[PDB]
CSV table of C-alpha atoms and ligand atoms in Angstrom, one decimal:
chain,number,residue,atom,x,y,z
A,4,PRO,CA,129.4,107.3,-5.5
A,5,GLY,CA,126.4,107.6,-3.7
A,6,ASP,CA,123.7,105.3,-5.0
A,7,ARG,CA,121.5,105.1,-2.2
A,8,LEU,CA,119.0,102.9,-4.2
A,9,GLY,CA,122.0,101.1,-5.1
A,10,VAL,CA,120.6,100.7,-9.3
A,11,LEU,CA,124.2,101.7,-10.5
A,12,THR,CA,126.0,99.3,-7.9
A,13,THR,CA,123.9,96.3,-8.1
A,14,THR,CA,123.1,96.5,-12.2
A,15,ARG,CA,127.4,97.3,-12.8
A,16,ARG,CA,127.6,94.0,-11.2
A,17,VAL,CA,125.3,92.2,-14.2
A,18,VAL,CA,127.1,94.2,-17.2
A,19,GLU,CA,130.5,93.2,-16.1
A,20,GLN,CA,129.6,89.3,-16.5
A,21,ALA,CA,127.0,89.8,-18.9
A,22,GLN,CA,127.1,86.9,-21.5
A,23,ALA,CA,124.0,88.1,-24.2
A,24,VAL,CA,124.6,91.8,-24.0
A,25,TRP,CA,127.6,94.4,-24.1
A,26,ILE,CA,128.2,98.0,-24.3
A,27,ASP,CA,129.7,99.4,-27.6
A,28,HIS,CA,131.6,101.9,-26.2
A,29,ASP,CA,132.8,103.4,-29.6
A,30,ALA,CA,129.2,103.7,-30.4
A,31,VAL,CA,128.7,106.0,-27.5
A,32,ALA,CA,131.8,108.2,-28.1
A,33,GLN,CA,130.7,108.7,-31.6
A,34,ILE,CA,126.5,109.5,-30.3
A,35,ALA,CA,127.6,111.3,-27.5
A,36,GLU,CA,129.9,113.6,-30.2
A,37,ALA,CA,126.7,113.5,-32.6
A,38,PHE,CA,124.1,114.3,-29.7
A,39,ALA,CA,126.6,116.9,-28.2
A,40,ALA,CA,127.4,118.9,-31.9
A,41,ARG,CA,124.1,119.9,-32.1
A,42,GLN,CA,123.8,120.5,-28.5
A,43,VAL,CA,120.4,118.3,-28.1
A,44,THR,CA,117.7,119.0,-25.5
A,45,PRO,CA,115.2,116.3,-23.8
A,46,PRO,CA,111.3,117.2,-24.2
A,47,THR,CA,110.2,119.4,-21.6
A,48,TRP,CA,106.7,117.6,-20.4
A,49,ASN,CA,104.2,117.2,-22.8
A,50,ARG,CA,101.3,118.5,-20.7
A,51,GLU,CA,98.8,118.2,-24.0
A,52,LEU,CA,97.7,114.6,-23.1
A,53,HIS,CA,98.6,114.9,-19.5
A,54,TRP,CA,95.8,115.5,-16.7
A,55,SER,CA,96.1,119.1,-14.8
A,56,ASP,CA,94.6,120.4,-11.4
A,57,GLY,CA,95.3,121.5,-8.0
A,58,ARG,CA,98.3,120.1,-6.0
A,59,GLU,CA,96.6,117.0,-4.0
A,60,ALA,CA,94.6,115.7,-7.2
A,61,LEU,CA,97.4,116.1,-9.3
A,62,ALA,CA,99.9,114.4,-7.0
A,63,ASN,CA,97.4,111.7,-7.0
A,64,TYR,CA,96.9,111.3,-10.8
A,65,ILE,CA,100.9,110.8,-11.1
A,66,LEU,CA,100.5,107.9,-8.9
A,67,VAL,CA,98.1,106.4,-10.6
A,68,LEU,CA,99.3,107.0,-14.1
A,69,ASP,CA,102.8,105.4,-12.8
A,70,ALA,CA,101.1,102.5,-11.2
A,71,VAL,CA,99.6,101.0,-14.2
A,72,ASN,CA,102.2,102.3,-16.8
A,73,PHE,CA,103.4,99.2,-18.3
A,74,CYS,CA,103.3,96.5,-20.9
A,75,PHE,CA,101.0,98.0,-23.9
A,76,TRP,CA,102.0,95.4,-26.4
A,77,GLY,CA,100.1,92.1,-28.2
A,78,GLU,CA,98.1,91.6,-31.1
A,79,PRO,CA,95.5,92.7,-32.1
A,80,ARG,CA,97.4,96.1,-31.4
A,81,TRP,CA,95.6,98.2,-28.3
A,82,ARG,CA,94.2,101.6,-29.8
A,83,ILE,CA,92.3,104.4,-28.2
A,84,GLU,CA,90.3,107.2,-29.6
A,85,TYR,CA,90.4,110.6,-27.5
A,86,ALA,CA,89.9,114.4,-28.9
A,87,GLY,CA,90.3,113.8,-32.8
A,88,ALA,CA,93.2,111.5,-32.7
A,89,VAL,CA,94.2,107.8,-32.1
A,90,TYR,CA,96.4,107.0,-29.9
A,91,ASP,CA,98.6,103.5,-28.8
A,92,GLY,CA,101.0,102.3,-26.3
A,93,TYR,CA,102.0,104.8,-23.2
A,94,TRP,CA,100.0,107.6,-25.1
A,95,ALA,CA,96.8,105.7,-25.2
A,96,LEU,CA,97.0,104.9,-21.6
A,97,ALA,CA,97.3,108.5,-20.3
A,98,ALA,CA,94.7,109.9,-23.0
A,99,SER,CA,92.5,107.5,-21.5
A,100,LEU,CA,92.9,108.6,-18.2
A,101,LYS,CA,92.4,112.6,-19.4
A,102,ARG,CA,89.2,111.2,-21.1
A,103,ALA,CA,88.1,109.2,-17.8
A,104,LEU,CA,88.7,112.4,-15.1
A,105,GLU,CA,87.4,114.7,-17.9
A,106,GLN,CA,84.0,112.3,-18.3
A,107,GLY,CA,84.4,112.7,-14.1
A,108,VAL,CA,85.8,109.7,-12.9
A,109,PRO,CA,87.2,110.0,-9.6
A,110,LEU,CA,90.3,108.4,-10.3
A,111,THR,CA,92.5,110.9,-8.2
A,112,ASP,CA,90.2,109.6,-4.8
A,113,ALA,CA,91.2,106.7,-2.8
A,114,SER,CA,88.2,105.4,-2.1
A,115,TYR,CA,87.0,105.0,-5.4
A,116,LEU,CA,90.5,103.1,-6.7
A,117,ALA,CA,90.4,101.3,-3.2
A,118,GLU,CA,86.9,99.7,-4.9
A,119,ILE,CA,87.7,100.1,-8.4
A,120,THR,CA,86.5,96.6,-10.8
A,121,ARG,CA,87.7,94.9,-13.8
A,122,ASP,CA,84.5,96.6,-15.3
A,123,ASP,CA,85.9,100.0,-14.7
A,124,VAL,CA,89.1,99.9,-15.9
A,125,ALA,CA,87.9,97.7,-19.0
A,126,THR,CA,85.4,101.0,-20.0
A,127,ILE,CA,88.4,103.3,-18.5
A,128,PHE,CA,90.5,102.0,-21.7
A,129,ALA,CA,88.3,100.5,-24.1
A,130,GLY,CA,88.9,101.2,-28.1
A,131,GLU,CA,90.5,98.8,-30.4
A,132,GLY,CA,91.8,95.3,-29.1
A,133,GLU,CA,92.3,95.4,-25.3
A,134,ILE,CA,94.9,97.1,-22.8
A,135,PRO,CA,97.1,93.8,-21.5
A,136,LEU,CA,96.8,92.5,-18.0
A,137,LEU,CA,93.7,94.1,-17.6
A,138,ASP,CA,92.9,92.3,-14.5
A,139,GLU,CA,96.1,93.1,-13.0
A,140,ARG,CA,96.4,96.8,-13.7
A,141,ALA,CA,92.8,96.5,-11.8
A,142,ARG,CA,94.7,95.1,-8.3
A,143,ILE,CA,97.5,97.2,-8.7
A,144,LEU,CA,94.6,100.1,-8.9
A,145,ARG,CA,92.9,98.9,-5.7
A,146,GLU,CA,96.2,97.9,-4.1
A,147,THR,CA,97.4,101.8,-4.5
A,148,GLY,CA,93.9,102.8,-2.9
A,149,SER,CA,93.7,100.9,-0.2
A,150,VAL,CA,97.7,102.2,0.9
A,151,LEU,CA,96.9,105.9,0.1
A,152,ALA,CA,93.6,105.6,2.2
A,153,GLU,CA,95.4,103.9,5.6
A,154,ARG,CA,98.9,105.4,5.2
A,155,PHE,CA,98.8,108.5,3.7
A,156,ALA,CA,95.4,110.1,5.0
A,157,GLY,CA,94.5,109.4,1.1
A,158,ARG,CA,96.9,112.0,-0.3
A,159,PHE,CA,100.1,111.3,-2.2
A,160,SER,CA,100.9,114.7,-1.2
A,161,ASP,CA,101.5,113.6,2.2
A,162,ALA,CA,104.1,110.6,0.8
A,163,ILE,CA,105.5,113.4,-1.2
A,164,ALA,CA,106.3,116.2,2.0
A,165,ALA,CA,107.6,112.9,3.6
A,166,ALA,CA,110.5,112.8,1.2
A,167,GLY,CA,112.3,116.4,2.1
A,168,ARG,CA,113.1,117.2,-1.6
A,169,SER,CA,114.8,114.0,-1.9
A,170,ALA,CA,113.8,112.1,-5.2
A,171,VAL,CA,115.7,108.8,-3.6
A,172,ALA,CA,114.1,109.1,-0.4
A,173,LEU,CA,110.5,109.1,-2.0
A,174,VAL,CA,111.4,105.9,-3.8
A,175,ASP,CA,112.4,104.2,-0.8
A,176,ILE,CA,108.9,105.9,0.7
A,177,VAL,CA,106.9,104.2,-2.3
A,178,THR,CA,108.8,101.0,-3.0
A,179,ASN,CA,108.3,100.7,1.1
A,180,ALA,CA,104.3,101.2,0.8
A,181,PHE,CA,102.9,100.5,-2.3
A,182,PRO,CA,103.9,96.2,-3.3
A,183,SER,CA,103.4,97.0,-7.1
A,184,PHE,CA,106.2,99.2,-7.4
A,185,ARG,CA,109.2,96.9,-6.0
A,186,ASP,CA,111.2,96.6,-9.6
A,187,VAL,CA,113.9,93.9,-8.0
A,188,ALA,CA,115.7,90.7,-9.6
A,189,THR,CA,118.2,88.3,-9.3
A,190,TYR,CA,121.5,87.4,-11.6
A,191,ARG,CA,123.7,84.6,-10.4
A,192,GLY,CA,122.4,84.6,-7.0
A,193,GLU,CA,122.6,88.4,-6.1
A,194,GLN,CA,119.9,90.9,-5.8
A,195,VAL,CA,119.7,93.4,-9.0
A,196,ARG,CA,117.6,97.2,-7.8
A,197,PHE,CA,115.8,98.5,-10.9
A,198,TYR,CA,113.1,100.7,-9.5
A,199,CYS,CA,111.5,101.8,-12.9
A,200,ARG,CA,108.1,102.9,-12.3
A,201,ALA,CA,109.1,104.4,-9.2
A,202,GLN,CA,111.9,106.4,-10.3
A,203,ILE,CA,109.4,107.4,-13.5
A,204,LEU,CA,106.8,108.8,-11.1
A,205,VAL,CA,109.7,111.1,-9.7
A,206,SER,CA,110.6,112.1,-13.0
A,207,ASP,CA,106.7,113.0,-14.0
A,208,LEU,CA,105.8,114.9,-10.4
A,209,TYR,CA,109.3,116.6,-11.5
A,210,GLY,CA,107.6,117.8,-14.8
A,211,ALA,CA,104.1,118.1,-13.5
A,212,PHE,CA,105.0,120.9,-11.1
A,213,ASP,CA,107.6,122.7,-13.1
A,214,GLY,CA,110.5,121.6,-10.1
A,215,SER,CA,108.2,123.4,-7.9
A,216,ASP,CA,106.1,122.5,-4.7
A,217,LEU,CA,105.7,118.8,-4.9
A,218,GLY,CA,107.8,118.6,-8.0
A,219,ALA,CA,110.8,120.2,-6.0
A,220,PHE,CA,113.8,117.8,-6.0
A,221,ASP,CA,117.2,118.9,-4.8
A,222,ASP,CA,119.1,115.2,-6.5
A,223,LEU,CA,117.6,114.5,-9.6
A,224,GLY,CA,121.4,113.6,-10.4
A,225,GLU,CA,120.6,110.4,-8.3
A,226,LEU,CA,117.5,109.3,-10.5
A,227,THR,CA,119.0,106.3,-13.3
A,228,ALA,CA,117.2,105.5,-16.8
A,229,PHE,CA,114.1,103.9,-16.3
A,230,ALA,CA,114.9,100.6,-17.7
A,231,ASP,CA,111.9,99.2,-19.6
A,232,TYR,CA,111.5,98.1,-23.2
A,233,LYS,CA,111.7,101.3,-25.8
A,234,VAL,CA,115.1,102.7,-24.5
A,235,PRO,CA,117.1,99.4,-24.7
A,236,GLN,CA,115.3,99.4,-28.6
A,237,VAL,CA,116.7,103.1,-29.1
A,238,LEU,CA,120.2,101.9,-27.4
A,239,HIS,CA,120.4,99.1,-30.0
A,240,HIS,CA,119.5,100.7,-33.0
A,241,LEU,CA,122.0,103.3,-32.1
A,242,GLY,CA,125.1,100.5,-32.1
A,243,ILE,CA,125.5,101.4,-28.0
A,244,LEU,CA,123.7,97.6,-27.3
A,245,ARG,CA,124.6,94.5,-28.8
A,246,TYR,CA,122.5,91.1,-28.4
A,247,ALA,CA,124.6,88.1,-28.8
A,248,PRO,CA,123.3,85.7,-31.6
A,249,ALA,CA,120.6,83.6,-29.5
A,250,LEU,CA,119.1,86.7,-27.8
A,251,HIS,CA,118.7,88.9,-31.6
A,252,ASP,CA,117.0,85.8,-33.3
A,253,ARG,CA,114.8,85.8,-30.1
A,254,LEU,CA,113.8,89.7,-30.4
A,255,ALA,CA,113.6,89.4,-34.1
A,256,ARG,CA,111.4,86.6,-33.8
A,257,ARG,CA,109.2,88.3,-31.5
A,258,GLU,CA,109.8,85.4,-28.6
A,259,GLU,CA,108.5,86.3,-25.1
A,260,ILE,CA,111.5,86.4,-22.7
A,261,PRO,CA,110.6,85.2,-19.1
A,262,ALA,CA,110.9,88.0,-16.4
A,263,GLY,CA,113.6,87.7,-14.1
A,264,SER,CA,115.5,85.6,-16.4
A,265,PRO,CA,119.2,85.9,-17.2
A,266,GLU,CA,119.1,87.5,-20.5
A,267,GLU,CA,115.9,89.9,-19.5
A,268,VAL,CA,118.1,91.3,-16.4
A,269,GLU,CA,121.2,91.5,-18.9
A,270,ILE,CA,118.7,94.0,-21.3
A,271,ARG,CA,117.3,95.8,-18.6
A,272,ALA,CA,121.2,96.4,-16.4
A,273,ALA,CA,122.9,97.4,-19.8
A,274,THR,CA,120.3,99.7,-20.6
A,275,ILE,CA,120.9,101.5,-17.2
A,276,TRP,CA,124.7,101.6,-17.8
A,277,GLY,CA,124.0,102.4,-21.6
A,278,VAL,CA,122.5,105.9,-20.5
A,279,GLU,CA,124.8,106.5,-18.1
A,280,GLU,CA,128.0,105.4,-20.2
A,281,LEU,CA,126.2,108.4,-22.9
A,282,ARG,CA,125.6,110.7,-20.3
A,283,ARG,CA,129.2,110.7,-18.7
A,284,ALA,CA,130.5,111.2,-22.5
A,285,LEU,CA,128.4,113.8,-23.2
A,286,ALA,CA,129.3,115.7,-20.3
A,287,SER,CA,133.3,114.8,-21.4
A,288,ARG,CA,132.1,116.9,-24.6
A,289,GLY,CA,131.0,119.8,-22.8
A,290,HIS,CA,126.9,118.5,-22.6
A,291,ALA,CA,125.8,118.4,-18.7
A,292,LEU,CA,122.6,116.5,-18.5
A,293,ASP,CA,121.1,114.1,-15.5
A,294,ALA,CA,120.4,110.6,-16.6
A,295,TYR,CA,116.6,111.0,-16.4
A,296,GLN,CA,117.1,113.8,-18.8
A,297,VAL,CA,119.2,111.3,-21.6
A,298,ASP,CA,116.5,108.8,-21.1
A,299,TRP,CA,114.0,111.0,-21.5
A,300,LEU,CA,115.6,111.8,-25.0
A,301,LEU,CA,116.2,108.7,-26.0
A,302,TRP,CA,112.6,107.1,-25.1
A,303,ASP,CA,111.9,110.3,-27.5
A,304,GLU,CA,113.8,108.8,-30.2
A,305,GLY,CA,111.8,105.7,-29.8
A,306,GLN,CA,109.0,107.5,-31.4
A,307,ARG,CA,109.7,107.7,-34.8
A,308,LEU,CA,112.4,104.5,-35.3
A,309,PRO,CA,112.8,103.6,-39.2
A,310,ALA,CA,110.8,100.4,-39.8
A,311,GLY,CA,112.9,97.5,-39.8
A,312,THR,CA,114.9,98.1,-36.3
A,313,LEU,CA,115.2,95.4,-34.2
A,314,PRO,CA,112.0,94.4,-32.1
A,315,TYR,CA,111.7,95.5,-28.8
A,316,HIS,CA,112.1,92.7,-26.3
A,317,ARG,CA,108.8,91.2,-25.3
A,318,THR,CA,108.4,90.2,-21.3
A,319,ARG,CA,105.1,89.7,-19.7
A,320,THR,CA,105.3,92.0,-16.1
A,321,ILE,CA,105.1,89.9,-13.2
A,322,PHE,CA,104.0,91.0,-9.6
A,323,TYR,CA,101.1,88.2,-8.8
A,324,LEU,CA,102.2,88.7,-5.1
A,325,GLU,CA,100.7,90.6,-2.0
A,326,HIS,CA,98.3,88.0,-0.5
B,401,QEO,N1,112.2,104.5,-19.8
B,401,QEO,C1,111.2,105.7,-20.1
B,401,QEO,N2,110.0,104.9,-20.3
B,401,QEO,C2,108.8,105.9,-20.3
B,401,QEO,C3,108.7,107.1,-20.8
B,401,QEO,C4,107.6,107.9,-21.3
B,401,QEO,C5,107.2,109.3,-21.9
B,401,QEO,N3,108.4,110.5,-20.7
B,401,QEO,C6,108.4,111.3,-21.0
B,401,QEO,C7,108.4,112.5,-20.4
B,401,QEO,C8,108.5,113.7,-20.5
B,401,QEO,C9,108.8,113.5,-22.1
B,401,QEO,O1,107.4,114.5,-22.5
B,401,QEO,C10,108.9,112.0,-22.5
B,401,QEO,O2,108.0,112.1,-23.6
B,401,QEO,C11,106.8,107.1,-20.8
B,401,QEO,N4,107.5,105.7,-20.6
B,401,QEO,C12,106.7,104.1,-20.5
B,401,QEO,O3,107.1,104.1,-19.0
B,401,QEO,C13,107.5,103.1,-18.8
B,401,QEO,C14,109.0,102.8,-18.3
B,401,QEO,O4,109.8,102.6,-19.4
B,401,QEO,C15,107.2,101.9,-20.0
B,401,QEO,O5,105.6,101.9,-20.1
B,401,QEO,C16,107.1,103.2,-21.1
B,401,QEO,O6,106.7,102.9,-22.3
B,401,QEO,C17,110.2,107.8,-20.7
B,401,QEO,O7,110.7,108.9,-21.1
B,401,QEO,N5,111.3,106.9,-20.1
């Protein structure tokens, strides 16, 4: 199997044992048949709302972007004005960085990031309501800058160069060096490995560089889905993920689910395998996509679900460590 990060191997043990979540392989077959019938294809890379520049500064942009790419929910809803449009969620994040960099804030400079304060980021992300975990995003941007400065001469380009066109080796280099990116958990006393933000970071570089230079990777097939909260919401909507009663009610009542709890780990593990079972079934029906592509394609559908879909699971992302 390969699986040199062990995301598939460890998460497969969760899916086999899982009590609150299961895959409906009949629904997988139906959806594969339909997505393959209209030979569907993923979004390219939405380079309207992503900042653009030279090799060194752009590679740093991607690392910063995915360093604070998490948890956008809470009331009142966090919205952002940018260039005549109002944005929320992940698109509010990317617009907020484009705006800032365009107003001349050096978010690609290690020295600036290492020193960046609560006040700075409060303003970078200012708008309707406030971005969740404002302080934690400040700490992570400081942590990101210091590591860039010390270990990679302020250039994420150096870290990427070291990977040698291996997506899998880059994720390893990232999690080894940047504590914020260490996305693992336990389930019934076993380590489960996810590497959500670390893995998406690799996919974003492939997008931003059109699979050339710093975005060149020979093993993108090895990436898994990026297990957060939108893709499972879509897989449930498509009938591929089923939730048992107590968990279905929590999600419907918009009750927060403690991070690293069995129910939370079950949803993320099932999201990885939900996407993988869909990739295999699409491949069987003559439509070969990589796992990250099926994830990109599903996250895409998540932007336009009908109102009255089961709400996404709400987890206060934790990393309150590195002391
Ligand atoms: N799993 C997953 N997550 C995605 C995305 C995206 C956007 N991906 C773009 C990349 C290529 C296409 O243009 C897609 O629109 C943001 N995010 C955000 O990244 C985090 C990890 O899921 C969450 O905060 C999401 O809101 C995705 O495709 N898959």
